[PDB]
Structure formats: structure tokens, C-alpha cells
Amino acid sequence: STGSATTTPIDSLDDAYITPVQIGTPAQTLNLDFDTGSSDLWVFSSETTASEVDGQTIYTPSKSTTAKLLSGATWSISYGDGSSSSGDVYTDTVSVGGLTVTGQAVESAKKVSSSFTEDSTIDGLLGLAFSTLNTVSPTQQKTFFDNAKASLDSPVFTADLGYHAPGTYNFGFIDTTAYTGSITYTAVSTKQGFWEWTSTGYAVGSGTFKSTSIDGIADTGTTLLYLPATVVSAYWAQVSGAKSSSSVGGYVFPCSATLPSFTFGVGSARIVIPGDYIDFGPISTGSSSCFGGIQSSAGIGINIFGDVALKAAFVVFNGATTPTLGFASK
Numbered sequence: 001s002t003g004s005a006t007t008t009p010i011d012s013l014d015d016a017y018i019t020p021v022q023i024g025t026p027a028q029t030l031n032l033d034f035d036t037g038s039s040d041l042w043v044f045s046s047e048t049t050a051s052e053v054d055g056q057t058i059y060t061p062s063k064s065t066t067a068k069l070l071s072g073a074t075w076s077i078s079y080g081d082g083s084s085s086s087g088d089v090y091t092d093t094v095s096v097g098g099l100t101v102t103g104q105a106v107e108s109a110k111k112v113s114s115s116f117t118e119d120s121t122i123d124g125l126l127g128l129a130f131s132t133l134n135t136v137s138p139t140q141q142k143t144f145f146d147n148a149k150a151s152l153d154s155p156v157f158t159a160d161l162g163y164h165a166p167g168t169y170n171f172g173f174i175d176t177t178a179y180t181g182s183i184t185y186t187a188v189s190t191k192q193g194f195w196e197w198t199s200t201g202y203a204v205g206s207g208t209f210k211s212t213s214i215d216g217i218a219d220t221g222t223t224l225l226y227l228p229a230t231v232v233s234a235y236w237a238q239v240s241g242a243k244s245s246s247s248v249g250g251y252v253f254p255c256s257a258t259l260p261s262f263t264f265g266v267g268s269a270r271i272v273i274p275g276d277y278i279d280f281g282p283i284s285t286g287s288s289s290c291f292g293g294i295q296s297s298a299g300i301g302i303n304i305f306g307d308v309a310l311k312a313a314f315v316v317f318n319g320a321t322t323p324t325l326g327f328a329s330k
């Protein structure tokens with residue numbers, strides 16, 4: 001089997017991407033944030049505290065003839081941005097782009113933090129990291145991909161995120177029309193539960209490539225590119241007037257600037273992030289100071305190849321017995 005679904009930016013900045021997911025019988029379609037940095041499939045629901053729902057579409061398990069309470073199971077997750085959610089668990093039929101999993105754990109939110117409430121466009125998350133990170137207790141549950149994998153034509157999924165445009169998540173096949181050149185594959189460590197890999201270096205604009213190992217995670221659920229402070233300083237030093245602002249929480253730059261590209265290494269291959277992809281717009285409406293899309297990972301504890309980086313590539317998440325990651329230009 002295979003599946004193929006379009007993923008759409010939630011706003012004009014590509015702050016996140018939503019993908020429609022069918023849950024239950026008859027189907028209830030919710031728009032979920034596919035997150036290769038976490039491993040829980042959770043949804044706004046008829047159980048979510050009413051004051052914490054503000055425009056999201058909810059899953060109502062009592063209206064699904066295939067929903068079954070997973071007795072005694074609870075979940076609770078905290079994300080890197082400080083947001084959180086928690087609740088109880090159903091199993092139900094879940095389909096993505098024509099690919100169906102029966103008995104998928106659907107984590108129903110009883111509580112969500114303010115950032116989730118305030119984003120009416122995201123109805124929940126669909127985790128695509130390794131199932132060892134799943135938070136369900138006392139019986140840990142599998143991700144949608146892990147449940148689907150054995151049925152897929154090939155044990156892979158791909159992320160093809162658009163810049164200010166829709167893109168695609170495919171399951172079970174590699175669309176050879178979706179990228180240019182060849183896909184370069186690179187080793188993954190699953191020891192932290194992530195799609196963790198080592199980039200071979202970077203360049204800023206037309207500058208020379210610096211060979212240096214940068215260990216980080218391929219994370220579709222993180223907006224920006226978070227790299228070591230040395231690398232980030234080297235980038236922003238090429239932008240007149242750019243500075244790290246403690247009051248804003250990172251690097252900002254004059255909105256009048258033309259940003260340089262940023263290249264990262266995948267083995268001997270190179271992925272080029274155009275400068276425009278690094279512009280996250282005014283810090284507040286009407287401001288001439290703009291948010292940067294490359295930020296320091298110092299204090300996170302891990303480097304994160306978020307959407308800014310991934311959207312410049314066609315990315316293969318290879319769930320073979322020994323997982324690997326592939327990157328191609330597009």
C-alpha cells in the first residue's frame with residue numbers, strides 16, 4: 001500500500017504545515033501537524049476543556065462506530081517550545097492520503113496549553129519520530145508510520161515541504177519526479193528517539209564550505225533552523241544590521257535586507273536554503289525589524305533541522321531495519 005497527502009502552510013510565513021487526516025467511521029477529517037520530532041498522534045476532541053477550544057475541528061469518539069476507549073491509558077506531552085497537552089486514548093481507524101491503519105492510538109486531549117488554543121488552524125499533531133518517544137502510559141503506543149510500515153510497498157515516508165506553497169507527504173514510495181539529481185542517504189541514530197543525523201558542514205551565501213560535523217534532528221514540527229552559535233553568528237555577520245536580541249529571543253535583522261543563502265552538507269552533497277526562506281517577517285505588525293529563520297541551538301541541547309532547512313529539500317525518512325535519511329535538491 002501507499003498514501004499521498006498534500007500539506008499546506010498554516011499562514012503566510014510557513015509557521016507550520018497542516019495535512020488532512022481521516023479518523024473514525026464515518027470519517028472525521030482533522031488537519032494535523034505532521035511532526036517528525038515527536039511520536040504521539042493527539043487531537044482536539046469532544047473531551048477537550050471547552051475554554052481551551054477556539055475554532056479547531058474536534059474528534060468526537062462517540063460518533064465513530066470504530067472508536068474504542070483504550071482502558072486506563074493516559075498521555076501527557078511537553079514540547080520544546082514549552083507547549084503541552086494531555087488526555088486519554090482511543091483506538092480507531094486513521095487514514096492519510098488513502099493509506100489506512102486500523103487500531104491506531106488516537107490520543108484525545110482533555111487539556112491543551114495556550115499556544116494550541118490560540119492556533120485555530122492546527123487540530124492536533126501526528127508524530128513521526130520513533131515510537132520509543134510515545135508518551136502513552138501504562139502501555140506505550142506505536143506511531144501511524146510504525147503501524148503502517150509492514151503494509152507499505154517500501155518502509156519509507158517522504159517530506160516535500162513547500163516554500164510559501166503546499167507540498168506533499170508520501171508513505172510507502174519515493175516519487176522520482178519530485179526531486180532533481182540524486183538522493184544522498186546518511187546514517188541515523190535512533191538513540192534519542194529522533195531522526196538524528198550528522199551534517200558534514202555549511203556555507204554562507206557564496207562563501208567557501210566549512211567542513212564540520214553538525215549532529216542534529218530532521219524535525220518537520222519545528223519551524224526554524226537551530227544550529228550552533230558559531231555557525232549562526234557566521235551567518236548573521238553577513239547581514240548588515242543583524243543582531244541577537246534578548247528581548248525578542250533571537251536574531252533579528254532589518255526588513256530592508258536581502259538575505260544570503262545558507263548551504264548545509266549531506267555527505268558530499270549540498271542543500272541550498274535560499275535567503276528568502278530565512279525571512280520570518282516583522283517582529284510585530286508594522287515593525288522594520290524582522291525575525292530570522294536561523295537561530296542558535298545553545299540552550300536547546302540539540303541542533304534542529306526544522307522546516308527552514310527541510311523545505312529546501314526532498315527528504316526521505318527510511319524506516320528500513322537500519323533507518324537512514326535521504327536528502328535531494330528539488
Ligand SMILES: CCCn1c2c(c(SC(C)C)nc1=O)CCC2
Nearest residue numbers: 013015248249250251280291292
Ligand atoms: C506571533 C510571533 C511569533 N513568533 C514568530 C517567530 C519568532 S522567531 C524569534 C524566537 C527569534 N518568534 C515569535 O514569537 C518567527 C515567526 C513567528
